[PDB]
Amino acid sequence: RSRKESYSIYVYKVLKQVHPDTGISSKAMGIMNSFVNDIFERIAGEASRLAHYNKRSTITSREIQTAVRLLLPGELAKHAVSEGTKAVTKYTS
Amino acid sequence: RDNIQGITKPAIRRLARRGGVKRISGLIYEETRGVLKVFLENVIRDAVTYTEHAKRKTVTAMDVVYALKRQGRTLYGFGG
Amino acid sequence: DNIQGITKPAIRRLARRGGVKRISGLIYEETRGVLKVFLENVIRDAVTYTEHAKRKTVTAMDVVYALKRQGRTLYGFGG
Amino acid sequence: RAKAKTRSSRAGLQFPVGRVHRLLRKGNYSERVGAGAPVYLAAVLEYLTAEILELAGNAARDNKKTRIIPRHLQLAIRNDEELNKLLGRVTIAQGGVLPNIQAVLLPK
Amino acid sequence: LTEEMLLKREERARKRRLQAARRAEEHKN
Amino acid sequence: RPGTVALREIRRYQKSTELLIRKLPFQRLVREIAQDFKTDLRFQSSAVMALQEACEAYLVGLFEDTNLCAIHAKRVTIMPKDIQLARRIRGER
Amino acid sequence: VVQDVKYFQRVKWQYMVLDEAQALKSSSSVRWKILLQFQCRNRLLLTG
DNA sequence: GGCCGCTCAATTGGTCGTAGACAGCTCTAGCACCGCTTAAACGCACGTACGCGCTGTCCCCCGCGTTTTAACCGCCAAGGGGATTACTCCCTAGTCTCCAGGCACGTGTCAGATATATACATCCTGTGCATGTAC
DNA sequence: GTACATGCACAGGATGTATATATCTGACACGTGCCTGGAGACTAGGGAGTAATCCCCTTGGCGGTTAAAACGCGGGGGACAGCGCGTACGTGCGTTTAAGCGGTGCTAGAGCTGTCTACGACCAATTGAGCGGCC
Numbered sequence: 001r002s003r004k005e006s007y008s009i010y011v012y013k014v015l016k017q018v019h020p021d022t023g024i025s026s027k028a029m030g031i032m033n034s035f036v037n038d039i040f041e042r043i044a045g046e047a048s049r050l051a052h053y054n055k056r057s058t059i060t061s062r063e064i065q066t067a068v069r070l071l072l073p074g075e076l077a078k079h080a081v082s083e084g085t086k087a088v089t090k091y092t093s
Numbered sequence: 094r095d096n097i098q099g100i101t102k103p104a105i106r107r108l109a110r111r112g113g114v115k116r117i118s119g120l121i122y123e124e125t126r127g128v129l130k131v132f133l134e135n136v137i138r139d140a141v142t143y144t145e146h147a148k149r150k151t152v153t154a155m156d157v158v159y160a161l162k163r164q165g166r167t168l169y170g171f172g173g
Numbered sequence: 174d175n176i177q178g179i180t181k182p183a184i185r186r187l188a189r190r191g192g193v194k195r196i197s198g199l200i201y202e203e204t205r206g207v208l209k210v211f212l213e214n215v216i217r218d219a220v221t222y223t224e225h226a227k228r229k230t231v232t233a234m235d236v237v238y239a240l241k242r243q244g245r246t247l248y249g250f251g252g
Numbered sequence: 253r254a255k256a257k258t259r260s261s262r263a264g265l266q267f268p269v270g271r272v273h274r275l276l277r278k279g280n281y282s283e284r285v286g287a288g289a290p291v292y293l294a295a296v297l298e299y300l301t302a303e304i305l306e307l308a309g310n311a312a313r314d315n316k317k318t319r320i321i322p323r324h325l326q327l328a329i330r331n332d333e334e335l336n337k338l339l340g341r342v343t344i345a346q347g348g349v350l351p352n353i354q355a356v357l358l359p360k
Numbered sequence: 361l362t363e364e365m366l367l368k369r370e371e372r373a374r375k376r377r378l379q380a381a382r383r384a385e386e387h388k389n
Numbered sequence: 390r391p392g393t394v395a396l397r398e399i400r401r402y403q404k405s406t407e408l409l410i411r412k413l414p415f416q417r418l419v420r421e422i423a424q425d426f427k428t429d430l431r432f433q434s435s436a437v438m439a440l441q442e443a444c445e446a447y448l449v450g451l452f453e454d455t456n457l458c459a460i461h462a463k464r465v466t467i468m469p470k471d472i473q474l475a476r477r478i479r480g481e482r
Numbered sequence: 483v484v485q486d487v488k489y490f491q492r493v494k495w496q497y498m499v500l501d502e503a504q505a506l507k508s509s510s511s512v513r514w515k516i517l518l519q520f521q522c523r524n525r526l527l528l529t530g
Numbered sequence: 531g532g533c534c535g536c537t538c539a540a541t542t543g544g545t546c547g548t549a550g551a552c553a554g555c556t557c558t559a560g561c562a563c564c565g566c567t568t569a570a571a572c573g574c575a576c577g578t579a580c581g582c583g584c585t586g587t588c589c590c591c592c593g594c595g596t597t598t599t600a601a602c603c604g605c606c607a608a609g610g611g612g613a614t615t616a617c618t619c620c621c622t623a624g625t626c627t628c629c630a631g632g633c634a635c636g637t638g639t640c641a642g643a644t645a646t647a648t649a650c651a652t653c654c655t656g657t658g659c660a661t662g663t664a665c
Numbered sequence: 666g667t668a669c670a671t672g673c674a675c676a677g678g679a680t681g682t683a684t685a686t687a688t689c690t691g692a693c694a695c696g697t698g699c700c701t702g703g704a705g706a707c708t709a710g711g712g713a714g715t716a717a718t719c720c721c722c723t724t725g726g727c728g729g730t731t732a733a734a735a736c737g738c739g740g741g742g743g744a745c746a747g748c749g750c751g752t753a754c755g756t757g758c759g760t761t762t763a764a765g766c767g768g769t770g771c772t773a774g775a776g777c778t779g780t781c782t783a784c785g786a787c788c789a790a791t792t793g794a795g796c797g798g799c800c
Contacts, residue, residue: 001636003561005271007297009772013266014301019309021318023552027170027346028308028320034169035304036297038342040275043293046242048281053238054226057572058762059281061288066225068296070218070242073337076303080296087295088288091263096421099414103712107409108445109467111349111402112452114459115357115395116466116613116721124469125448128476132447133422136440141426150633151701152423154435161343161443168446170322170345171439178741180593195602195732229751230583256564256769268772270563284572284762319552323406343446345439351403352453354460359393365630371697372630391614391719411711413623431632431701466613466721484786485548488626488707511787533799540793546786556777564769573760584748589740597736608724616717623711629703636697646686653681660673665666 007036043067061088100126136160176205215239259287260294267294267301307332322346392465408441415441451475484513490520498522503529 011032012024024032046067047059056063061084068080105122139160144152154171161168181201188196188204218239223231237251259269273290276282307328308320315324326347329335402409416437423430451472458471476482483490498520500506506514506527 003773006773007267007301010266010268010298011301011305014298015305015309015320018302018306019313022309022312023319025319025321026551027322028325030170030172031322031325031344031347032301032305034171034173035339036301037173038167038169039297039300040272040293043296044276044279044281047289049238050222050225051282053222053234057282058284058286059276059289060286061292062225064289064292064296066221069221071338073334076300076334076338079303080299083295083299084292087263087265088291091259091269091288091291094421096414096418099411099418101411101414101712104410107398107402108448109452109455110395110398111409112449112456113353113357113399113403114452114456114467115392115399118466118468118613120469121467121472124472128451128472129444129448130418130422133419133440133444136443137419137423138426140436141423141430144430145427150429151431151433152436153433153634154439157436157439157443161439165341166343166443166447167341168343168345168439168443171435171442182593198731232752253565253768258771259564268563271772274562286762343443345442346406348406349403349449351400353399354456356460356463357396357399357465359396368631392721393614395614411623434701464722468722505787508787512785513787531800535798536796538793538795540791542792543790544788546788548784550782550784551780553780554778558774560771560773562770562772565767567765567767569763569765570759571761571763573758575758576756577754579754580750580752582749582751584750586745586747588744589742591740592742593738593740595736595738597734599730599733601733602731603729605727605729607726609722610724611722612719613721614717614719618715620713621709621711624708626707627705631703632701634697634699636695638693638695640691640693641688642691644688644690647684649684650682651680653677653679655678656676658673658675661671662668663671665668 006033008033011036039071042071046071061085097126097130100129135164139163176209179205179208215243218242259291263291263294265291265294265298267298269294272297304328304335307335323348326350408445410441410445412441415444454479484516487516487519495520495522498525499528500525501528503527 006029008029011029015022015024043064044067047063050063050066051057051059065081065084068084069077072080102122105125106117109117109121109125136157137160140152140156143156143159144150147156155173158168158171158173184201184204185196188200215236216239219231219235222235222238223229226232226235228235233251237247240247259273260267263269269290272294273285273287276285276290276293304325305320308325311328311331312318312320312324315327317324322344323346326344327350329339329344330350416432419437419440420430420432423432454475455467455471458474459465459467462471500517505511506517508514
């Protein structure tokens, strides 16, 4: 059978961190799943362009650092680049 | 048959009042109905082409969501 | 500060291709702002493609990819 | 080998590095998805998730309720000039619209 | 060529009483 | 008085969250507009709700742009020429 | 029964038992106002 | 002529039951993900070959500072077209019901057009030269 | 009437390709079961209509001054050579992820259990309006 494959666990694990007193309605879970899913397609789509725009075969942290810098607006871009470098810094040791 | 007139005069009043307009000249209704119908027509045609390609009779929520991505006028919360 | 080098006459000519019958004197200085902020979009995107390529030089492709991402693609440069 | 753990936990993330890698590698975005990409992307998605949830939680609490509903999300994003660029042409199911008037309308 | 609903009708008909009876025996305890 | 209850009506529909078009008239209108793309279509119950959410949102944004046209021309009264201006400068048609 | 009125009314309940029947002791009750209307022939009250 | 006496029709206060809808399970089962392989191709580091883009002085139509004017801006008050809101009746949208039928998905095994090893060949890109179109 | 950019051909290696091969994705045929098209009965709010009446947009006359169009004053933008910092090829070396086949965790489902608010509803207190007495 098919399976829903949603981000619902992880958006809830994050809500329970940022507002421990607060819950998610089933329709707001839909909006959050849509937002995560669309931003993944937007970033991975631009990363696939950015690889072929340099005729590189891989995608790595630099392709996605570039895609974040292009796709995100002001303060969110530098914050997302900071979070990506922090997670990769911990992951690489 | 004649269903474009089913967008009722109070429904236009309310939808325009959510849009914040103060006075509706009675000239507004039929052009607003036609404009709406043409936006529906584009979204429906696109959704029907996805449905025809998918070898499928039923138009799904995914087909209208993909038509809204194809038109760059996206809608979150219906899945995807 | 070099944006003042974009001339009031050139802004009249550029508006007259758009078919306007008459101008007003505030348009010239505000158009310089509109041009500067449009550049401050497309250049920063093009530089971001330039940096990804490890380049010092902003190429035709770097600005074409920015203009394509901005949804204002220009045919006749790159490919 | 004894006691496996998620690559999310190794990155210090909630978001699923395995799932993100799987989706990148079956989506045909590249012929070679290096593992730094899904870690970085999971972190980016988790940050955007935290920012948008925190704004929605503030909007919900300001509207005196302890649950995120699509109305509280629309009243978060249309109250932020950054996310109103990132989501600037997306529609929210049950979100409605921001309360707004041009000053020329108001009487007397 | 025309009786073809019967082999669909029976499959639903046997479900009706079974599920109603199943729920009417959650009412046991 | 007139125009005062018309203004007081704005704050009610801008605070309230429900759909303003009638479901059955909209449902038939989608099926009508589909008939000369294809006969004998089936529509999933969720799909027509999504189409209604998209259509009410498209009209609310077009009504804000209509209000901008009218108020720029120093009118509190909207006219079809405001829709013709908006649908041109939108880049749609 | 005080809620699902239509969905009881569509079936012809021939004969009625009503039970711990002190529940109907006020005409101001929405119970009493509704329960008068079911088209049964014989009504039997089990007043404890 | 005025106020209060007995009665009974009245707001105003706490437990019962439900239903929406999460919240957290409360497991549990399954299917992806993680682990630790065996392995090789893309990326780097490295130098090398070179246009290509900066930076120098010449030179004319373009930039820019002042001239009257006439039609466009925008005001003000007329003036009449028309939008709102008053109010009740009418009718079709809502709602849930339920059928019975179509058809979306499930899910099984078979098999054919695809990837790809490697062997061909002719297709069509860099450079040169002949000469005619827009200026 | 002019000659620099276009238009045709040479030189030649790579890329479009055929023959030869193994196989997993797609086609097909089967049924389950999900659920949507139809269609029924009734509710009672949404809408349309008749209707009253209030007020905005366009309109026409008029006065003001700004851009237009013309003109005078004078320099910086379009074009040629040298400088020297980058950009594009090609290789060795191997960093890096591939692709593999199991071991295990955690993520997902349906449902339970627990809300638990939050809503009508019933139940019992106690209070104001209803009608009558008195000097």
